[PDB]
Structures are given as structure tokens and as C-alpha cells.
């Protein structure tokens, strides 16, 4: 009960910054996650024994894929922790509880393939879930793990609080479908600019939490250039393997997934920062002003990608 997780000094300070990299030591990531729940949510939010057992079941259910792996899940939870800690009073007790859990679970049992490849492959999951296929799977895996004996970290919540936290988690994980991000940001943009954006309207909150999930999910672009550049390599390792599988089905993949178009990567990144990342962190900064460092870091990494094209690195 009076057992506070602490981290070494360098981690203790840098884990508060948006650009923190969780490091290459896999065995510290669980404790990094508990530290963030204890500081963000409180040391009373979860029974430590149920949480530690939930985390190791979630770890065991991520695959050894190059990018959509356990390290991605903890990276995404850290970004959310940073947003929650810089926006302390704006969020409910259930929201802080649910959103760090949602982030840790948002890519559960990912295979390293897009919703598109499952649909073209005709995967069973594509029959069961026709849209946001992997994301409905990720939420279904999350419910499965909570229902393992000893694993219900929400045991102490009332029946109504329970249904509300699982609804937050569900919307949170569905929101990580990048296909739903474009329409979600446009509506938030309109509601902020016109001026009807209302954090008491539950449908409005959902949209904000949605944008935060995209923000945390894309957060490789808000890191130190070497982290951003090396994560990119793991992102393209999955995309090019999907490209190979597409070719095996007799379908030329989109250039993004074609290893034969590596040369065009720097230009593909410009598109992504301009079409997806920068709009995401801009609307996020407009709605939640203290998330500005994500936007500053993102603009910095777009500038680094322009230098690659100019041949200066
Ligand atoms: C952090 N983080 C997350 C993602 C990401 O997208 N997702 C998360 C992982 O799951 C699928 C979604 C990226 C990213 O790099 N995204 C894209 C890269 C890209 N390269 C080309 C390209 C390359 C060569 C030639 C032409 C185009 C196109 N193009 C589109 C993209 C998008 N969107 N970075
Ligand atoms: Mg995902
Ligand atoms: Zn993800």
C-alpha cells in the first residue's frame, strides 16, 4: 500500500516530457507504466496485484512484429500520461483510469497488417468486423483479458462506472483507426472555429479523446530526430512485408508498402506530416493548449525530413 514505484533520476525527470523515449530495456517498461498510473491516476486506482497481472497478460498478447509491438503500446500510454499530466483538471477520475489502460491495449494482438490487407486476404476477422476490423479485435482482446480470473483491474468500480470506463476504452481504441481520424479532426476544427465546442457535451468529449488517441498513436513524430528516424525503419519494415503479401495475392501494393519505392520514403513522410501529423497536433494544441510541445516537436521532425530530400543528411 505504501510502496511507491520510483525511477532513476534521469527517467524520473524526462518521463514528464512529451518526447521521452521509454528506452531499450523491456523489463523496465511494466514498472514505467505502473509509475505513470500511480502519478496520473493515484496509487489507489488499481489493486497492484491485479494491475501487474493485467499488464503481463497484455504484454504476452502483443506479437514480436517490428512496430505494432509491446514497446509501441507503452510508448503510446506514455504520450497519453504526458497529455493527462499537463491537462490535470480537464479530465474525470474514470477518464485517467480508462485512457492509460486503453493506450496499453489499443493494438493488442496486432499481426503487422492493415485493415485493408485482412479484407483483401479475406481474414475471418474481416467477416466478423467489416470496418475498423483490427480495432474491434483490439477492444475484444481487452475485454477477454479483463475477464481472466485475477485480471479485473476495475473490480472496485460500481456497475455504472464499470460500463462507462469500458465505453471510454472502446471509443478510445476504435478512434485509433486512422480512417476515422480525418472526419474526427474536421468536426473538432469546425466546433473550435465556429465556437460551439463544449467539454460538457459527452459527444464532444468523445471527439477530443479521439484526437488524443490519434495524437498518442502517431507520437513517433514528436520525438528526438534519431528516435523518429529509427522508428520510421520499423514502420516501413511492416509496410513492405504487407506489400510483399499483397504481391503474393496478385495485387500491386500502394507505393507506401512497396519496398521497391524506398527512394520515395522522404517524400512519403512529407505527405504524412502535412496530411496527418501536423493537422492532428495543431487541432490538439488549439483544444488543449499545453500539448503545444507535440506540435513543436512534429514541425521539427518535418524539417528534418525536408533536409533528407535536400541531401544535407
Ligand atoms: C508514427 N507513424 C504512424 C504512421 C502511420 O501511418 N500509421 C501507423 C501505423 O499503421 C498505419 C498508419 C506513420 C507513417 O509513416 N505513415 C505514412 C507513411 C507513408 N509513407 C508513404 C510513402 C512512401 C513511399 C512512397 C510514397 C508514399 C506514404 N505514407 C503514408 C502514411 C500514412 N498515413 N508514422
Ligand atoms: Mg492500431
Ligand atoms: Zn498503435
CATH label of the domain that carries residue 153: 1.10.1300.10
Distance of CA 227 to the CA centre of its chain: 16
CA distance 311 to 227: 20
Asked if the structure places residue 209 within a domain, the reply is: yes
- Please check whether residue 19 lies inside any domain of the structure: no
CA of 73 to the centre of ligand 3 (A): 7
State the sign of the Cα–Cα–Cα–Cα dihedral 233, 234, 237, 243.
Answer: negative
Q: Give a yes or no: residue 5 inside a domain.
A: no
72 alpha carbon, closest ligand? 3
The sign one gets for the Cα dihedral 60, 77, 9, 19 is positive
Query: If 0-12 CB within 10 Å is exposed, 13-18 middle and 19+ buried, where does residue 294 land?
Result: buried
Per-residue exposure over 102-128, b if at least 16 CB sit within 10 Å of its own CB, e if not: bbbbbbbbbbbbbbbbbeeeebebbee
b/e per residue 134-161 (b: at least 16 CB within 10 A): bbbbbbbbbeebbeeeebbbbeebeeee
Does residue 99 sit within a domain? yes
The CB of 255 under 6 Å from ligand 1? The reply is yes
Which experiment gave this structure? X-ray
Please tell me whether 234 is known to bind a ligand: no
Is the CB of residue 235 below 6 angstroms from any atom belonging to ligand 1?
Answer: yes
The answer to whether 244 is a known ligand-binding residue is no
**Of these residues, 68, 110, 123, 137, which one is catalytic?**
68
Full residue range of the structural domain in which residue 78 is found: 28-310
Q: Is the minimum distance from the CB of 264 to ligand 1 under 6 angstroms? A: yes
Taking the C-alpha atoms of residue 9 and residue 296, their distance in angstroms, rounded to an integer, is: 26
Distance (Å) from CA 272 to ligand 1 centroid? 6
Q: Is residue 7 a part of any domain in this protein?
A: no
Query: By C-alpha distance, which of 181, 200, 167 is closest to 90?
Result: 200
Binding residue per annotation — 204? no
- Tell me if 8 is assigned to some domain: no
Domain assignment present for residue 10? The answer is no
Q: Is 122 annotated as a binding residue?
A: no
Q: Give the Å distance between the CA of 26 and the centre of ligand 1.
A: 25
**Residue nearest atom 12 of ligand 1, based on CA coordinates:** 178
Residue 12 lies in a domain: no
Task: For a ligand 1 pocket test, name from 138, 235, 236, 298 the mutation site with the most ligand atoms within 8 angstroms of its C-beta.
Answer: 235
Q: Residues within 5 Å of ion ligand 3 by Cβ?
A: 107, 217
72 C-alpha to ligand 3 centroid (Å): 6
Residue 68 annotated in active site: yes
Of ligand 1's listed atoms, the one at least distance from the Cα of 220 is: 1
Backbone angles phi, psi at 115, to 5 degrees: -50, -40
State this model's resolution in angstroms: 2.1
- 10 Å CB burial of residue 3 (0-12, 13-18, 19+) is exposed
Q: Report the number of distinct structural domains present in the chain.
A: 1
Contact (Cβ atoms closer than 8 angstroms) between residue 246 and residue 252? yes
SS (H, E, C) the chain: CCCCCCCCHHHHHHCCCCCCCCCCCHHHHHHHHHHHHHHHCCCCCCCHHHHHHHHHHHHHCCCCCCCCCHHHHHHHHHHHHHHHHHCHHHCCHHHHHHHHHHHHHCCCCCCCCCHHHHHHHCCHHHHHCCCCHHHHHHHHHHHHHHCCCCCCCCCCCCHHHHHHHHHHHHHHHHHCCHHHHHHHHHHHHHHHHHCCCCCCCHHHHHHHHHHHHHHHHCHHHHCCHHHHHHHHHHHHHHHHHHHHHHHHCCCCCCHHHCHHHHHHHHHHHHHHHHHHHHHHHHHHHHHCHHHHHHHHHHHHHHHHHHHHHHCCC
The set of long-range contacts for 265-273, using a CB threshold of 8 Å and a minimum separation of 24, is: 265/232, 265/236, 266/305, 266/308, 266/309, 267/309, 269/232, 269/302, 269/305, 270/302, 270/305, 270/306, 270/309, 273/221, 273/298, 273/301, 273/302, 273/305
Amino acid at each position: 500500500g505504501l510502496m511507491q514505484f520510483t525511477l532513476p533520476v534521469r527517467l524520473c525527470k524526462e518521463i514528464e516530457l512529451f518526447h521521452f523515449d521509454i528506452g531499450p530495456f523491456e523489463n523496465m517498461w511494466p514498472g514505467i507504466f505502473v509509475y505513470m498510473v500511480h502519478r496520473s491516476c493515484g496509487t489507489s486506482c488499481f489493486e497492484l496485484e491485479k494491475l501487474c497481472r493485467f499488464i503481463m497478460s497484455v504484454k504476452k498478447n502483443y506479437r514480436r512484429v517490428p512496430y505494432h509491438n509491446w514497446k509501441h503500446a507503452v510508448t503510446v500510454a506514455h504520450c497519453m500520461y504526458a497529455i493527462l499530466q499537463n491537462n490535470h483538471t480537464l479530465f474525470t477520475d474514470l477518464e485517467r483510469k480508462g485512457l492509460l489502460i486503453a493506450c496499453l491495449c489499443h493494438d493488442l494482438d496486432h499481426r503487422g497488417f492493415s485493415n485493408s490487407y485482412l479484407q483483401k486476404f479475406d481474414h475471418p476477422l474481416a467477416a466478423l468486423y467489416s470496418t475498423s476490423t483490427m480495432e474491434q479485435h483490439h477492444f475484444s482482446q481487452t475485454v477477454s483479458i479483463l475477464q481472466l480470473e485475477g485480471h479485473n483491474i476495475f473490480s472496485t468500480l460500481s456497475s455504472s462506472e464499470y460500463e462507462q470506463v469500458l465505453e471510454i476504452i472502446r471509443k478510445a481504441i476504435i478512434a485509433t483507426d486512422l480512417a476515422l481520424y480525418f472526419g474526427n479532426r474536421k468536426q473538432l476544427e469546425e466546433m473550435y472555429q465556429t465556437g460551439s465546442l463544449n467539454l460538457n457535451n459527452q459527444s464532444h468529449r468523445d471527439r477530443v479523446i479521439g484526437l488524443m488517441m490519434t495524437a498518442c498513436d502517431l507520437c513517433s513524430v514528436t520525438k528526438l530526430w534519431p528516435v523518429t528516424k529509427l522508428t520510421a525503419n520499423d514502420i516501413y519494415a511492416e509496410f513492405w512485408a504487407e506489400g510483399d503479401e499483397m504481391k503474393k495475392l496478385g495485387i500491386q501494393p500502394i507505393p507506401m508498402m512497396d519496398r521497391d519505392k524506398k527512394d520515395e520514403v522522404p517524400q512519403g513522410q512529407l505527405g504524412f506530416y502535412n496530411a496527418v501529423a501536423i493537422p492532428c497536433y495543431t487541432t490538439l494544441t488549439q483544444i488543449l493548449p499545453p500539448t503545444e510541445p507535440l506540435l513543436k516537436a512534429c514541425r521539427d521532425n518535418l524539417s528534418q525530413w525536408e533536409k533528407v530530400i535536400r541531401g544535407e543528411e
